Design a protein around this ligand. Sequence first.
Ligand code: HEM
Length: 392
Amino acid sequence: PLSYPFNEAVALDVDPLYAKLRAEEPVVRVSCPFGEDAWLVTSHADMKTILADPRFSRALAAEHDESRLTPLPIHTSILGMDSPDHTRLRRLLAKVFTMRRVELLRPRIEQEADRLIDALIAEGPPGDLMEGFAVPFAGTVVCDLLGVPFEDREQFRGWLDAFSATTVMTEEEIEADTERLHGYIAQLMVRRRAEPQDDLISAMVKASDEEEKLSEKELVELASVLLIAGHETVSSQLIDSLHVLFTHPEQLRLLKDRPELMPGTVEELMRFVPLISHVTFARYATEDVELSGTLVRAGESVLPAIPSANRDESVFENADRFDLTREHNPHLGFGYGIHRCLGAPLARLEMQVALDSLLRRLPELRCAVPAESLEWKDGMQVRSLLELPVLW
Ligand code: HEM
């Protein structure tokens, strides 16, 4: 069995093996850094099957030593459940995390992007689009929506890596930091139960309390994943997307000249950015299933290599090319099926507002160093820059 990951992720380079596997052996047995051996799945079509077909279970991972890249299984809350418990949380969350609520955030989101650019200009070039834009932009937006005080970021930001770290933290540190975040949210919940605000933690507590829909621990773990997705995943995708744009200047000039391309541009960035470093969370087969010629037996695990699916030449013409005009884009960057991203409307709003604001306010935006000089954050389940120095 091949040792997986084959190679540590470098910048946004995709490992050439995936294209070889997609063409010659789309499903391959691997050993994982932790837990049971698994079947790596590489193709778009098989990705949809393992993500959405009910013969594949997230909740069954709990009955295994879960195939994974993290030292401990992650507390993935709703993303670790099947029906019926998944339906229960999906419904509570959908009911409070509505499209209307998100769209009504637009003036505040736009204002926050303007305020961050104001500070960049006041402080003078070069600016860091990571710590000086993407991080505080995503942070203030999710903190506002969830109800986690952004002023507490100095306390909680240090615990988030525990939910994502592969090689760089010990079990003992992951457990400790996981406890710290869970316990921080639980304290917040006591305040929000007694003193509701216009935020998701308050709405969730109210819905759960008035229907006894969820246990306190379920509410804690669910709010925690929402904080992580809003804070870490959004800022990672955003900074990575800025790198793609700077490293494909011709597409950047096009976007600046044709701002009506933004919605398709954000979708192409979702596809093209290999955001997930390797795979998302493993599923287990409840019965035998054949995938691209390989028999996956009942009780065996599958690793969904979503970024490789988004480079599937059989689904996207010139899948190795970044083209923000791309019309056919059934990308899986927001997942697919039962666990597909509930945050996608919010993430698309943020991506669009952030990119449009920077290009409208900073027409001459360009990366201030060569790509070779950039420092990436290694040992995590998503890729991100640590700094993106820019000029304007
Ligand atoms: C660019 C930013 C984001 C990306 C790329 C992203 C991507 C994804 C992907 C690929 C999945 C499915 C994972 C799998 O099936 O293994 C997912 C699920 C999910 N995402 Fe996101 N996400 C983003 C932002 C957000 C935000 C802002 C929120 C909420 C504040 C959020 C909440 C969730 C939840 C709750 C799920 C699980 C849904 C379920 O199990 O039913 N995400 N996301």
